[PDB]
Amino acid sequence: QTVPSSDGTPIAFERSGSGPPVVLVGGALSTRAGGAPLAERLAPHFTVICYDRRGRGDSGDTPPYAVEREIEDLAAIIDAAGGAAFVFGMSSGAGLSLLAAASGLPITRLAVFEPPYAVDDSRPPVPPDYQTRLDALLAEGRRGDAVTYFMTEGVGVPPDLVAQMQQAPMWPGMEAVAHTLPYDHAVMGDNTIPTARFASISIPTLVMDGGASPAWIRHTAQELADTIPNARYVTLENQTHTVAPDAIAPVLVEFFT
Ligand SMILES: [Cl-]
């Protein structure tokens, strides 16, 4: 189904399961499909809502883009969930979720995985021309190259892993929503943490990283779990690069219940 955001944009979503509501918020290049495997593991415990962020999947889009519009989208989805919910945010979706929490949305418990803020030099510098170059690639219709650029220069993934992603079934779906990469850049700002705002988040919070996280992601996670007063920091037990639903779900079930 869809629900209208404040600006009229139809936001597509699906519900499954039973129990208290959980909203899954996806990151860069995600659509609602991305959360489906996790949602299915959570469904025995929670009513889970997965949704397409604006400009993706079955959702519409209403220019001009503003981060506030995506906070309003999430507000509409939390309303679809009943008016308040637990939230799990992934990657840049964790940034959006933290901003939404700081803005006063009715998020009752918050879990975030690998929010891609930067707190130290162990993260490679993002090129100063990142926004300009990303826009240029998109304007030429080089969607694949835009994704490659985001992964290598935006979030510091080594070229070998990115080339492997290009061979995976995931890649065409990412290309299809590459025009939203500037939206995630806007959500994340310059990757610095808005400490004053996040320190004001009072709800129970869980910050997670994975066994293959780069050092800079660990440091960010540690700092967020210190800045947010009621936060814990968990490193997941994934045994390869890919974090599977069963590495995340039990931790979420424990934290949310
Ligand atoms: Cl391309």
Automatic annotation (TrEMBL):
GO molecular function: hydrolase activity
Binding sites annotated in the UniProt record for (R)-malate: 28, 92
Database matches in Pfam families: Abhydrolase_6 (PF12697)
Every AB hydrolase-1 domain range: 22-244
Entry keywords, A to Z: Hydrolase
InterPro entries: AB_hydrolase, AB_hydrolase_1, AB_hydrolase_fold
Protein's UniProt keywords contain Nucleotide-binding: no
Keyword check for Flavoprotein: no
Protein name, per record: Alpha/beta hydrolase fold protein
Domain of life (superkingdom): Bacteria
Gene3D superfamilies per record: alpha/beta hydrolase
